[PDB]
Design a protein around this ligand. Structure first.
Ligand code: FAD
Length: 456
DNA sequence: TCGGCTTCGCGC
DNA sequence: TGCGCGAAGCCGAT
């Protein structure tokens, strides 16, 4: 649909129909940003072709009640900065509240929309909203992959088993899809308050907060400043200060050598393609550049491939055949320890390293990547059943992680607990053939003592 | 029908 | 600290 620096493989028609005479509505959801947004840039191209304005809509769902203050305040503060950014380009933003299956369908008919466009997300709750809006509208409905560099439906046509089967497929399409972004043109035709949704949003989640003994809450919101502008600063500080020694200090949680980009990448406050653009042009360690590109391109986009082609990505059914047979054969094995969800949540286990990992999760909202594997694997070893292990790990992840409720989370937890995108290993107690990670293995990799004392 | 796929453990 | 190095399945160029 028109344009030259616009790859049509990023667009796919979700429903046919006659193009209305009204404005193009962009149902933004996953990629909350003004710049470097294919879904917003595509909506402008269709809007410019029909001589209609482009409008952005956002439907705040009732699923923030399963997500606390740390994820609500991080999202809402970025939406307030986004509203000012879109207003500078004369693009109005409308913020709705309720079921998107009924609010979006009511919004298009009331505003007399001509074409509806939205971003891509492989989550189950998004596929239900889409089908509910297709049966309630009469205008064409388009969908853009603005999160992945290579469109999810174009990178692979099936669920990829491991990373070595997905790496040559992704890198073969890189010269075509890795491109610069055109500047968002402003509107030529101008035609709820967020401060109130934030006040009414926190007061409902105040009782469900994580507090210490003296009613002192555990979350430290000064570690990550939300917003599109702040997300660019974290990227700039990563390339100049942390990219050189990233390839060597990536498995050391005592060194702040990660990009710290996942909270902005999950909420779409920064484009992963823009990060790859700047990383590919920077002169750093070739081992560190290949190590970082392999995380934000291969592992990040294979998680979308895992959730898009496996509807039960958060269940035991999505595990490989060799894993399910191994975990079922070790269901009657005697567990050395058994902890409930409340014991895992408060970090009241016998392992000081695991408790230190959980304390970093509760206090900073972003637990180190290497400790996240030790964190989720110890849950499987100290639980009643593999089904309970998956339930506790997903619950604690999507509640305190700033990057929670993300395909990277479900695919990461499935990698540690169900061996997805991995292979079998030494046969062991309880965990069977799933890869085991011990306290002593982390002691030789990094100063474990420094990690415990930092988080009690 | 082999090949070498990490974010492993553990011994120089 | 790098470097080996067993121990286990299923994919993919054949
Ligand atoms: C049990 C478990 C749970 C996780 N929970 C989440 C989660 O809820 N949300 C989330 O976005 N990621 C999660 N991760 C992936 C990974 O832990 C985080 O991406 C990473 O820790 C975030 O910090 P970073 O961006 O500074 O890491 P970096 O080394 O700087 O990587 C940058 C980006 O690459 C991506 N990435 C890196 N590693 C992975 C990976 N193993 N899988 C998928 N993407 C990756 C991330 O998007 C990340 O933002 C989880 C992994 C595991 C094993």
């Amino acid at each position: 649909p028109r344009g030259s620096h616009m790859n049509p493989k990023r667009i796919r028609a979700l429903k046919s129909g006659k193009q209305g005479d009204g404005p193009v509505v962009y149902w933004m959801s996953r990629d909350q940003r003004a710049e470097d947004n294919w879904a917003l840039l595509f909506s402008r191209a269709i809007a410019k072709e029909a001589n209609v304005p482009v409008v952005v809509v956002f439907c705040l769902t009732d699923e923030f009640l399963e997500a606390g203050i740390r994820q609500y305040e991080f999202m809402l503060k970025g939406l307030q900065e986004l509203e000012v950014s879109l207003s500078r380009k004369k693009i109005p933003s409308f913020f709705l509240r309720g079921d998107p299956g009924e609010k979006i369908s009511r919004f298009v008919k009331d505003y007399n929309a001509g074409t509806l466009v939205t971003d891509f997300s492989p989550l189950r709750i998004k596929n239900q909203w889409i089908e509910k809006v297709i049966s309630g509208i009469s205008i064409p409905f388009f969908e853009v992959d603005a999160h992945n560099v290579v469109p999810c439906w174009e990178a692979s046509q099936k669920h990829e088993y491991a990373a070595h089967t997905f790496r040559p497929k992704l890198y073969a399409l890189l010269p075509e899809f890795l491109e610069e972004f055109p500047e968002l043109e402003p509107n030529s035709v101008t035609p709820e308050t967020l401060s109130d949704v934030l006040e009414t949003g926190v007061k409902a989640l105040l009782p469900e907060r994580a507090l210490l003994k003296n009613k002192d809450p555990l979350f430290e919101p000064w570690h990550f400043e939300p917003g599109e502008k702040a997300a660019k600063k974290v990227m700039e500080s990563f390339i100049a200060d942390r990219l050189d020694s990233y390839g060597a200090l990536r498995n050391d949680p005592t060194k702040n050598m990660l990009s710290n980009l996942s909270p902005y990448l999950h909420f779409g406050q920064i484009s992963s393609q823009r990060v790859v653009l700047e990383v590919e042009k920077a002169e750093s360690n070739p081992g560190s550049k290949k190590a970082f590109l392999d995380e934000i391109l291969i592992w990040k986009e294979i998680s979308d491939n895992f959730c898009y082609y496996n509807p039960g990505y958060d269940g035991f059914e999505s595990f490989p055949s060799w894993a399910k047979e191994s975990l079922n054969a070790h269901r009657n094995d005697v567990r050395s320890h058994i902890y409930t969800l409340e014991e895992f949540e408060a970090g009241k286990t016998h392992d000081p390293l695991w408790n230190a990992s959980q304390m970093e999760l509760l206090s900073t909202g972003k637990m180190h990547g290497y400790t996240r594997m030790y964190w989720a694997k110890k849950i499987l070893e100290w639980s009643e059943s593999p089904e309970k292990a998956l339930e506790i790990a997903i619950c604690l992840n999507d509640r305190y992680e700033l990057d929670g409720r993300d395909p990277n989370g479900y695919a990461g937890i499935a990698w540690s607990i169900g061996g997805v995108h991995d292979r079998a290993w030494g046969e062991r107690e309880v965990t069977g053939k799933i890869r085991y990670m011990s306290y002593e293995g982390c002691k030789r990799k990094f100063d474990v003592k420094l990690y415990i004392e930092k988080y009690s």
